[PDB]
Amino acid sequence: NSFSGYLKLTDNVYIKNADIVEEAKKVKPTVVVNAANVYLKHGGGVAGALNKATNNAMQVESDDYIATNGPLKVGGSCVLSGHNLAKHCLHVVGPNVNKGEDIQLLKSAYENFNQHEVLLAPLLSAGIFGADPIHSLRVCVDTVRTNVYLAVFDKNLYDKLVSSFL
Ligand SMILES: COc1ccc([C@@H](Cc2nnn[nH]2)NC(=O)c2ncnc3[nH]ccc23)cc1
């Protein structure tokens, strides 16, 4: 968990303009969060990038988890191997608001972060899931009580977040 170049927004929320895959390779955190869907199919976005960095080992493990346990619920999570990126990967499902899943479930999604003392994570329900990313950071700040290090890929979004926050 040797994080560098973060800006402290609150007592427990830190932010950096970084690619989460590169941060995971430098820091080797105990937990990296994946922005997953309920069937753990890592087709694009953060999930596709983390899976590609494991050379599809995350997808093969995820398929075995789904065959044995069934899909996750929206707002839910599971802990699987972090492979070469982290000790563990916490796969978290935020609501896809573009598909009618309630925005209220973004709070439930961030509550899964509280099981882990320190996490490297992306913003949840952003990208194709359609939530406003600044709203997602607000929910993160209001819900997560453990130490979260957020990696925001787009510099334009990073600047809007830092301006809206501290
Ligand atoms: C479907 O859920 C999503 C959640 C978040 C996301 C977005 C939110 C975002 N948009 N501009 N910066 N951040 N984040 C990433 O895609 C992302 N973030 C950090 N490192 C990365 N490496 C490769 C991809 C990537 C998309 C989709």
Does residue 50 line the site of ligand 1, with CB under 6 A?
Answer: no
The DSSP secondary structure of 23-92, one letter per residue, reads: HHHHH--SEEEEE--TT----SHHHHHHHHHTTTHHHHHHHHHHHHH-PPPTT-EEEEE-TTT-SEEEEE
Please answer whether residues 55 and 46 qualify as being in contact, where contact means their C-beta atoms are separated by less than 8 angstroms: no
The rounded Å distance from CA 34 to ligand 1 centre is 10
CA distances from 152 to 73, 74, 147 (A): 25, 23, 16
Ligand 1 pocket, 20 CB below 6 A?
Answer: yes
152 three-state secondary structure: strand
User: How far, in Å, CA of 143 to CA of 160, rounded?
Assistant: 21
Phi, psi of 161 (to 5 degrees): -65, -50
What does the angle CA 72 – CA 123 – CA 12 come to, to the nearest 5 degrees?
A: 105
Sign of the four-CA dihedral 98, 101, 102, 106? negative
Q: Is the dihedral of CA 138, 110, 70, 50 positive or negative?
A: positive
End-to-end CA distance of the chain: 23
Each domain of the chain, given as residue ranges in start order, spans 1-165
Residues 6+ apart with CB under 8 A from 2: 26, 27
* Measured distance CA(84)–CA(70) in Å, rounded: 25
Please give the helix or strand (H or E) that residue 157 lies within, else none.
helix 155-164
- C-alpha pair distances (Å), 92 with each of 47, 134, 164, 166: 10, 19, 25, 26
Q: Residues 118, 126, 91, 83: what is their CA dihedral angle, to the nearest 10 degrees?
A: -80
The CATH number for 1-165, chosen from 2.60.120.10, 3.40.1190.20, 3.40.220.10, 2.40.50.140, is 3.40.220.10
Q: What are phi and psi of 47, to 5 degrees?
A: -60, -45
Centre of ligand 1 to C-alpha 70, Å, is: 25
Entry resolution (Å): 1.1
Q: Token pair of 123, please?
A: 């913003």
Q: In the numeric block, which tokens belong to residue 94?
A: 């935020």
Q: In one letter, which amino acid is 57?
A: A
- Contact present, 9 and 166 (Cβ < 8 Å): yes
Nearest alpha carbon to residue 21 among 58, 57, 46, 56: 46
Using the atom order of ligand 1, give the atom closest to the CA of residue 128. Answer: 1
SS3 content of the chain, % helix, strand, coil (to 5): 40, 20, 40
- Cβ-based neighbour number of residue 60 at 10 Å: 12
Exposed/middle/buried for 70, CB within 10 Å: 0-12, 13-18, 19+?
A: exposed
Phi, psi for residue 151 in degrees, rounded to 5:
-105, 115
